[PDB]
Amino acid sequence: NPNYCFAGKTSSISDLKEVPRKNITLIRGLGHGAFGEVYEGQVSPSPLQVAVKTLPEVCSEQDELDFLMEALIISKFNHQNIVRCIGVSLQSLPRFILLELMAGGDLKSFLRETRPRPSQPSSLAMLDLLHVARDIACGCQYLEENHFIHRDIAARNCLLTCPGPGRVAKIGDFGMARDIYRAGYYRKGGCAMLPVKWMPPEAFMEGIFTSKTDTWSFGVLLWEIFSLGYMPYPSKSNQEVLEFVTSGGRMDPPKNCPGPVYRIMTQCWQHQPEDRPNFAIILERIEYCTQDPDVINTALPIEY
C-alpha cells in the first residue's frame, strides 16, 4: 500500500520480513519509545536477541502508517553503524518491529552513567569517545552518500551494542525522518517537540534540509559526546538557543575537550552550509584526532 523509496528502489509492506509470532518471545520491558513500549526479546537453542518496538493496539490510522514507514525505512538500510532490522510481526496484534538488540542502551544514558568517578576512575577515556564519534560519523556518511537526511542526529537516538570495551555505536532512531517522509513536514510534532538545539539556522528558519543539516547536528552530538552526556546549551531554552545560534553564538568546549576535537565542532557549526564539512572530511579529522597523542592522552574530568 504505501511505497517507500530509498537509494532509487521502491519497497512496500510486502517486502518486509514477516516473522511468525510464535517465534517471538518477550523477555522484559526496557521503557517507552515515542509511541509504545520497547522490549528485550528473542527470535528462534541460540535465538537472535532483539529489541521489540510495539505499536499500541489503541492507535490512529496515522499511527499505523507511521509504524509501517518506520519498518520500511530501517529495513532498507544496510550499514554496520545503523541498527539492523531482523523483521516485523505486523499480522498479529500488537504489531512488532524487531531490531538488533543494542545491549549498551542509548548513548546519552551511557555517557551519563559511565562517566569517570571516584569509584570507577577509568570507566572511559578520550579514545572511547573518539571511537563512538567515528562509529556514528561512518553511519552518517552512509546516509549522506545515499542522499538520506536524518534530521535528528543526537545522542538519544544512538545506541551501543554492549556496555563494556568493544562497544559499537549505531544510529537507532529514524522517527523524525519518518514524520517528514509521510507528510513533508512536522505534522505529528510541534514547535515544542522540534529538536531545536540540534538544528542549523537554515533548518529552523527556512525549513531547508540537506546533508549539511546532519553535519551541524553531528557537531552538537560531538559536544554531547565529549561533555559526557550534558544537555546542549546548558541553561538555555529552545527559543534562547534559536536566537543565540542565529546571532552567531556557539557552545564553548566541553570540559577538558582537546582543541582539535573542539575545532571539528566549530567547523560543523559554520553558518553557511557550504562552509561545513561533509562526513568524509569529518571522518578524516576524527581519524587524525585518534592518531594524536596529545588528544588521546588528555584525561577526562572525574565527576565527584
Ligand SMILES: COc1cc2c(cc1Nc1nc(Nc3ccccc3S(=O)(=O)C(C)C)c3[nH]ccc3n1)N(C(=O)CN(C)C)CC2
Ligand atoms: C538490553 O537492551 C537495552 C536495555 C536498555 C535500553 C536499551 C536497550 N536496547 C535497545 N533499546 C532500543 N530502544 C529503546 C529502548 C528503551 C526505551 C526507548 C528506546 S527508543 O525509543 O528506541 C530510543 C533509543 C530512541 C533499541 N532500538 C533499537 C535497538 C535497541 N536496543 N535502555 C535505554 O536505551 C534507555 N533510554 C531509552 C533512556 C534502557 C535499558
